[PDB]
Amino acid sequence: MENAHTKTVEEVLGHFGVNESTGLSLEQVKKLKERWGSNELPAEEGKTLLELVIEQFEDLLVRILLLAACISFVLAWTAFVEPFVILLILVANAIVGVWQERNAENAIEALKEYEPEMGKVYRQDRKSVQRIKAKDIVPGDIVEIAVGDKVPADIRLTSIKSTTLRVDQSILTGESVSVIKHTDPVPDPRAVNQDKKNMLFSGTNIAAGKAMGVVVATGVNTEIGKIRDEMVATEQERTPLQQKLDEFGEQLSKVISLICIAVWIINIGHFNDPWIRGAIYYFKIAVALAVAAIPEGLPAVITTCLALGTRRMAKKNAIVRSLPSVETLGCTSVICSDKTGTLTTNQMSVCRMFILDRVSLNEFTITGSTYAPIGEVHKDDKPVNCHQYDGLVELATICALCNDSALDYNEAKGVYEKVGEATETALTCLVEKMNVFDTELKGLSKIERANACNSVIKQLMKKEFTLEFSRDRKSMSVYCTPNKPSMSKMFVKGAPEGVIDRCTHIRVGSTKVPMTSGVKQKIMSVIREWGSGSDTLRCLALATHDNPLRREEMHLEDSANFIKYETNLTFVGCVGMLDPPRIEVASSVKLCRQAGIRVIMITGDNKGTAVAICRRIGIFGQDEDVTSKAFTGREFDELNPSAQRDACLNARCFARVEPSHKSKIVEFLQSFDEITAMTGDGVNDAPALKKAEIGIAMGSGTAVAKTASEMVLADDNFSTIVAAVEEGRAIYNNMKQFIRYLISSNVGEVVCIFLTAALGFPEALIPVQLLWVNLVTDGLPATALGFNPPDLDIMNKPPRNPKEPLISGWLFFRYLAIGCYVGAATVGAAAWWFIAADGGPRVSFYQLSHFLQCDNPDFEGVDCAIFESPYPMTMALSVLVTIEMCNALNSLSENQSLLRMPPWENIWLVGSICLSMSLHFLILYVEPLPLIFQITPLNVTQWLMVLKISLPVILMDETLKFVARNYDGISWPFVLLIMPLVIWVYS
Numbered sequence: 001m002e003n004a005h006t007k008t009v010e011e012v013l014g015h016f017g018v019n020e021s022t023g024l025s026l027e028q029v030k031k032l033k034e035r036w037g038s039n040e041l042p043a044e045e046g047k048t049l050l051e052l053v054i055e056q057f058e059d060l061l062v063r064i065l066l067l068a069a070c071i072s073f074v075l076a077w078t079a080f081v082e083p084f085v086i087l088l089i090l091v092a093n094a095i096v097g098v099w100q101e102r103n104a105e106n107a108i109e110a111l112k113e114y115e116p117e118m119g120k121v122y123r124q125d126r127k128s129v130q131r132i133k134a135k136d137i138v139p140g141d142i143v144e145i146a147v148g149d150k151v152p153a154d155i156r157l158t159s160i161k162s163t164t165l166r167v168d169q170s171i172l173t174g175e176s177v178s179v180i181k182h183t184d185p186v187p188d189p190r191a192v193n194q195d196k197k198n199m200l201f202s203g204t205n206i207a208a209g210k211a212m213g214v215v216v217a218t219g220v221n222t223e224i225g226k227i228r229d230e231m232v233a234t235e236q237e238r239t240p241l242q243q244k245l246d247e248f249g250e251q252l253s254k255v256i257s258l259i260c261i262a263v264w265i266i267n268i269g270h271f272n273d274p275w276i277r278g279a280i281y282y283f284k285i286a287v288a289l290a291v292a293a294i295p296e297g298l299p300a301v302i303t304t305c306l307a308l309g310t311r312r313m314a315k316k317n318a319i320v321r322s323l324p325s326v327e328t329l330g331c332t333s334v335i336c337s338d339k340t341g342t343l344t345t346n347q348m349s350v351c352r353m354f355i356l357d358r359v360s361l362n363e364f365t366i367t368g369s370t371y372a373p374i375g376e377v378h379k380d381d382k383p384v385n386c387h388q389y390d391g392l393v394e395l396a397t398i399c400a401l402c403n404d405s406a407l408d409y410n411e412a413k414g415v416y417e418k419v420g421e422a423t424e425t426a427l428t429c430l431v432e433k434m435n436v437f438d439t440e441l442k443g444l445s446k447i448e449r450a451n452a453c454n455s456v457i458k459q460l461m462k463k464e465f466t467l468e469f470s471r472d473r474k475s476m477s478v479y480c481t482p483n484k485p486s487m488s489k490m491f492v493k494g495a496p497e498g499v500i501d502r503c504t505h506i507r508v509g510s511t512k513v514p515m516t517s518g519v520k521q522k523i524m525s526v527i528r529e530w531g532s533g534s535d536t537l538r539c540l541a542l543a544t545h546d547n548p549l550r551r552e553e554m555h556l557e558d559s560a561n562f563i564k565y566e567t568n569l570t571f572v573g574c575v576g577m578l579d580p581p582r583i584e585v586a587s588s589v590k591l592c593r594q595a596g597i598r599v600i601m602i603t604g605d606n607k608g609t610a611v612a613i614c615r616r617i618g619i620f621g622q623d624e625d626v627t628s629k630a631f632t633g634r635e636f637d638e639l640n641p642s643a644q645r646d647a648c649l650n651a652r653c654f655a656r657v658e659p660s661h662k663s664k665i666v667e668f669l670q671s672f673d674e675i676t677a678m679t680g681d682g683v684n685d686a687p688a689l690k691k692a693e694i695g696i697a698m699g700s701g702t703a704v705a706k707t708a709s710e711m712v713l714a715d716d717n718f719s720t721i722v723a724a725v726e727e728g729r730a731i732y733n734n735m736k737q738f739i740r741y742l743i744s745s746n747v748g749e750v751v752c753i754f755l756t757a758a759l760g761f762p763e764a765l766i767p768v769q770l771l772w773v774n775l776v777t778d779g780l781p782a783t784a785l786g787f788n789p790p791d792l793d794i795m796n797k798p799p800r801n802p803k804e805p806l807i808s809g810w811l812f813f814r815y816l817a818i819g820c821y822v823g824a825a826t827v828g829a830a831a832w833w834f835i836a837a838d839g840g841p842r843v844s845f846y847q848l849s850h851f852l853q854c855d856n857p858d859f860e861g862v863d864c865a866i867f868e869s870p871y872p873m874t875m876a877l878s879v880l881v882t883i884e885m886c887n888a889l890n891s892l893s894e895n896q897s898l899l900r901m902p903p904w905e906n907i908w909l910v911g912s913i914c915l916s917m918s919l920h921f922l923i924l925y926v927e928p929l930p931l932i933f934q935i936t937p938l939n940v941t942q943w944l945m946v947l948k949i950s951l952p953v954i955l956m957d958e959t960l961k962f963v964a965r966n967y968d969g970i971s972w973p974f975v976l977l978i979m980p981l982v983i984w985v986y987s
């Protein structure tokens with residue numbers, strides 16, 4: 001059974017062999033369940049923990065360091081510690097990542113429903129209806145639907161028991177109003193879900209109807225199943241941050257290979273016949289170079305900064321489901337959106353209402369955009385005590401009495417939920433907000449305040465019967481008699497032009513006057529203005545009967561009597577309600593436009609309500625033309641390629657689109673080379689939440705949209721998006737700062753190794769020393785720089801370029817030059833202990849390179865064994881550590897030097913610098929640690945010489961910042977504080 005909206009009832013009955021009155025036998029349901037399967041969707045289709053580490057260990061630099069470590073194991077035939085420690089980091093920066101991907105999930109199913117929906121099915125085993133599970137339903141079952149029931153599977157309606165059927169498909173098609181159904185089939189075979197007015201869909205609940213139908217699809221063949229299939233079929237690429245990091249790692253591998261082949265070419269010119277006894281030094285220098293040219297602490301500090309960003313975002317009720325998705329909202333330029341459920345509260349609510357005061361209209365405006373009865377009334381200002389207006393009392397009566405829906409507090413959710421029609425619920429919450437009898441709303445509880453006003457207004461009035469909302473009359477009536485008394489009233493609510501034409505009287509307060517044409521044209525004009533301009537509403541005319549016909553002759557069997565008896569009515573007023581946008585979007589869209597981020601609203605509703613809400617929230621103006629900024633599904637499908645391109649580049653409101661259409665729009669926007677960020681809550685945004693870069697979902701949305709997303713706004717707030725944009729921008733700035741710092745340090749170490757290897761000097765930096773430096777002494781300052789203060793106007797400039805590099809061009813020179821100097825300094829330190837060491841062997845300047853052979857004494861230099869003393873290695877390590885402390889101290893801002901920003905402005909940076917220095921002193925004076933590698937505590941004059949060698953790096957980088965920025969001052973505290981520190985070392 002492909003589709004049943006084209007075939008009649010008898011057709012599908014013969015196709016399924018099921019009779020409506022009897023039901024299905026046990027053999028039939030058993031065979032259907034074995035052929036089609038259970039009515040349930042799979043669970044998250046995911047992978048366990050045993051494969052995430054293999055997925056995360058596929059990068060390039062990780063393989064380079066693995067090759068270096070395996071070469072180290074080979075040459076390490078006396079316990080070796082160099083290749084082991086780094087492995088621990090490979091477990092520290094990975095598991096934590098996994099710890100995120102699980103934890104976020106633990107924060108999603110916490111706000112999910114726990115009730116398994118049931119279903120009323122007629123089967124041949126029993127005579128009455130059977131309440132069974134939602135999974136054992138098979139195509140062919142006679143399912144009965146009532147008010148408030150959630151449809152369990154795709155159903156083709158067969159018999160509408162009630163006079164009408166209202167279905168709320170806002171979950172699937174985004175329609176804000178309850179759709180009316182009809183048993184008649186639609187001949188359109190390829191009709192959209194908004195055209196099949198004889199079918200039902202899973203998840204969509206019945207608003208105010210009741211009927212019986214046959215099942216057509218189930219499980220995966222249903223609409224939600226097809227959506228989940230299209231969602232899981234779509235692919236999700238990597239975030240731009242990870243792409244930049246991968247490009248940078250590729251460049252790093254390239255430069256490592258280049259410097260390694262350079263060292264190889266330089267070294268092969270001396271040694272011949274690759275001897276294998278001396279080739280161990282070549283492999284040692286190669287692994288030392290390969291580990292010095294790898295920022296082992298960079299992935300750890302990046303994961304730390306991303307985890308801190310996620311911890312900061314989770315305070316805004318935004319569960320982020322991955323680490324690198326915090327920066328994805330930093331470079332985003334477009335933010336797609338959904339009208340129903342995301343921008344609008346999806347809860348119909350009244351905004352204004354007018355009565356007539358012709359001895360002139362009195363128009364009040366109601367505040368509130370949800371189902372919570374905590375709103376207020378406003379005429380112009382000064383919230384009016386509504387007990388004075390007798391006409392408003394009559395309006396409250398005529399509206400609250402003619403109702404069938406209600407509100408109730410759900411303690412499991414914590415929000416007033418509707419039961420029944422949405423529009424009648426908006427009207428009853430109007431009643432609850434506007435109390436004409438001045439009842440108390442402070443001491444009573446919430447579950448009772450949900451209907452206190454309506455129960456009070458229903459005490460003195462006993463509803464006799466109800467004339468249901470018909471099609472041609474398009475107005476519903478209620479006959480009621482006032483309790484504790486000629487005394488009888490018949491209330492009517494309906495379409496404006498469908499009631500005024502039958503309204504032959506006018507109720508000015510408590511005075512009933514005949515009908516005049518002037519006030520009729522006036523109210524008709526004001527109603528046509530209320531629901532056709534930039535503030536289109538849903539108007540409801542209200543009229544009561546002065547002399548209702550008696551009940552003994554009132555016949556409720558014929559359809560024509562519903563209109564014949566509804567004559568000689570008097571107008572009481574009108575009500576205007578709509579699907580209101582959230583109170584935190586009108587300003588957030590402006591704050592997001594200031595940041596140069598365009599906001600598009602893609603939805604499946606009609607273009608009228610879409611453009612109305614789009615004007616109301618602030619994307620358009622009350623008079624702005626929308627001829628080229630408001631497209632329909634058919635309109636977008638009937639455009640040439642260039643037309644579609646300029647549309648998706650200029651349009652800002654798409655209405656009447658399918659989920660596949662949303663995916664098409666998102667992939668067009670991404671084809672325009674710009675990061676997108678789609679939000680949504682329904683089972684229609686899921687195919688387009690995965691296609692987007694950072695798919696955002698709402699906390700009150702559906703499970704499919706929350707599982708096809710990378711963020712879940714639990715509080716449904718929309719300013720959380722701009723907060724996350726700001727946080728992502730700050731995170732990226734800090735990240736590109738500390739990555740450049742780490743790379744400068746690494747290039748310094750690498751040029752030190754290259755110089756000490758090409759010149760011929762003995763080893764000055766062994767790998768394990770580089771491991772410890774790059775891990776601790778480089779991660780503490782990097783983690784400190786990850787807390788840089790945000791820019792004063794970070795949210796006032798257009799989004800970042802998608803192709804900008806982490807290592808700028810000219811800047812790549814800067815952090816190279818200083819870096820090179822670092823290397824030299826380190827080498828110098830070693831050379832110092834071989835030249836001007838007062839307690840060291842002053843080896844000849846031309847015989848220091850020839851150290852591998854010096855063993856017999858052939859010259860004045862003797863003791864050819866001190867060349868492995870811990871003192872030169874300690875000099876090099878100490879000067880490198882202090883030069884990196886100075887580099888991290890001055891790398892606090894991008895362009896402005898220290899003479900325009902003090903280093904103690906970022907207290908975390910100076911704190912981490914002091915901690916790293918005290919830890920470097922802690923590794924000298926302690927007993928067992930200086931025994932792992934080859935170091936030794938230094939003298940006072942040696943430390944002073946190291947400081948004298950390493951301090952000019954700050955002067956070099958200051959003057960380089962100056963010459964890069966140039967093409968009064970705050971130096972007084974600088975020349976007050978740092979002057980003794982510099983004048984004390986040169987005396």
Ligand code: BEF
Pocket residue numbers: 173174175338339340341602603604605681682684685
């Ligand atoms: F929920 Be949206 F209107 F597609």
Ligand SMILES: [Mg+2]
Pocket residue numbers: 170174338339340341342680681682
């Ligand atoms: Mg929605």
